[PDB]
Design a protein around this ligand. Structure first.
Ligand SMILES: CN1CN([C@@H]2O[C@H](COP(=O)(O)OP(=O)(O)OP(=O)(O)O)[C@@H](O)[C@H]2O)c2nc(N)[nH]c(=O)c21
Ligand SMILES: Nc1ncnc2c1ncn2[C@@H]1O[C@H](CSCC[C@H](N)C(=O)O)[C@@H](O)[C@H]1O
Length: 264
C-alpha cells in the first residue's frame, strides 16, 4: 500500500531545478559516442556501419547479455529510423525484419541503410501500430513510450502499449523485447505480472537510459520478481540524485553494423 519508490523518484525529479536536472539526467549512465555516426549521417554514408540512432546500442546491450535472441521473422513496432530493425538484420538466425513506424511531421522516418543484412529489412512508415492488426512473428520488438511529467499519463500510455503488445504476443513469438515506459505504477505492475505469467520473461534496466526516465525492457530472456527488479532501479536512480560532484556518463564505443547483403 501507499506510494511506490518510483513515484517518489518521479516527484523528486519534477522538483529539481533546471541546472540540477540536466546534470542529473546523464549522471553515471552509459553513453555511446555518436560523433562518428553524426558525421556519417550528414555525409550520407550508408556503408560505414554507423547505427541510425542510439537505440542500436540499447538493443545491443540486451542481446549481448542474452536477454533476447532475435530469430526468424522479426517485427519491430515503432521502428523510427530503424536502429533496432537494422541491428536485428545482423543476427545469425534472423530471416526477415518488418518495421512499422508512424513517421510524419515531428517524428522519425525510416532511414535507408546498407548495414549488413539491409536487404531483409522492410520498414513501413505512416503506420499507427495501435490500429495495425497483429501478424505472426518469431521475434517481437517494441520501443514505443512517450514521456510525460505526469506518472498517471505515463501509466495510461504504458497500459495502452501492453494491451497492444499482448495481441502480438498471443501470435506466437517466443523472443521479445518491449519498452516499458512507466514500470513503477501499481496498475502497470499488475499487468506486467499477468503478462509475465502468460508470456514469461522479465524486466531489465538498460544503463544506457537517462536517469530522467524509468524505462525498463520486458524481455523474454529475463526472469524473476518484477517488483524487486523495478524497486532496485528506483533505488539506483534516487541514489544518483543531489550528488556532491557530478561524474557524468561513462562513454562507450558505438555498435558497428558493417555492410553487405545476407543470403535469403
Ligand atoms: C525538461 N525536463 C523534463 N523533466 C522530467 O523528465 C522527464 C523526461 O523528460 P526529458 O529529460 O525531456 O526526456 P524526454 O522527454 O524523453 O527527451 P528525449 O526525447 O530527448 O529523451 C519528464 O517527464 C519530466 O518529468 C524535468 N524535470 C525538471 N525538474 N526540470 C526540467 O527542466 C525537466
Ligand atoms: N502509435 C505509434 N505507431 C507507430 N509508431 C509510433 C507510434 N507512437 C510512437 N511511434 C514511434 O516510435 C518511435 C520510438 S523511438 C524508436 C527507436 C528505435 N528503436 C531505434 O532504435 O531507432 C518514434 O519514432 C515514434 O515516432
Amino acid at each position: 500500500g501507499g506510494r511506490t519508490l518510483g513515484e517518489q523518484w518521479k516527484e523528486k525529479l519534477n522538483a529539481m531545478g533546471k541546472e540540477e536536472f540536466f546534470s542529473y539526467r546523464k549522471e553515471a549512465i552509459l553513453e555511446v559516442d555518436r560523433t562518428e555516426a553524426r558525421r556519417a549521417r550528414r555525409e550520407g554514408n550508408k556503408v560505414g556501419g554507423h547505427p541510425v540512432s542510439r537505440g542500436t546500442a540499447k538493443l545491443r546491450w540486451l542481446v549481448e547479455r542474452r536477454f533476447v535472441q532475435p530469430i526468424g521473422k522479426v517485427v519491430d513496432l515503432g521502428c523510427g529510423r530503424g536502429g533496432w530493425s537494422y541491428y536485428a538484420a545482423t543476427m545469425k538466425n534472423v530471416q526477415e525484419v518488418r518495421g512499422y513506424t508512424k513517421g510524419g511531421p515531428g517524428h522519425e522516418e525510416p532511414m535507408l541503410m546498407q548495414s549488413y543484412g539491409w536487404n531483409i529489412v522492410t520498414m513501413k512508415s505512416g503506420v499507427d501500430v495501435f490500429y495495425k492488426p497483429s501478424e505472426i512473428s518469431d521475434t517481437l520488438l517494441c520501443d514505443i513510450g512517450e514521456s510525460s511529467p505526469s506518472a498517471e499519463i505515463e501509466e495510461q500510455r504504458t497500459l495502452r502499449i501492453l494491451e497492444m503488445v499482448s495481441d502480438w504476443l498471443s501470435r506466437g513469438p517466443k523472443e521479445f523485447c518491449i519498452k516499458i515506459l512507466c514500470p513503477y505504477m501499481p496498475k502497470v505492475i499488475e499487468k506486467l505480472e499477468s503478462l509475465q505469467r502468460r508470456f514469461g520473461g522479465g524486466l531489465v534496466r538498460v544503463p544506457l537510459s537517462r536517469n530522467s526516465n524509468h524505462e525498463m525492457y520486458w524481455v523474454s530472456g529475463a526472469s524473476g520478481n518484477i517488483v524487486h527488479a523495478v524497486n532496485m532501479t528506483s533505488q539506483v536512480l534516487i541514489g544518483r540524485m543531489d550528488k556532491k560532484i557530478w561524474k557524468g556518463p561513462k562513454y562507450e564505443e558505438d555498435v558497428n553494423l558493417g555492410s553487405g547483403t545476407r543470403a535469403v
